[PDB]
């Protein structure tokens, strides 16, 4: 997704 972002997804 983006991670380090709105929350975190697949990189988190």
């Amino acid at each position: 997704v983006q991670a380090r972002w709105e929350a975190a997804f697949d990189l988190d």
Side-chain angles (χ1 to χ4, degrees):
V1 172
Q2 212 300 85
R4 29 91 87 75
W5 79 331
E6 249 212 94
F9 256 121
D10 201 277
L11 350 166
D12 178 23

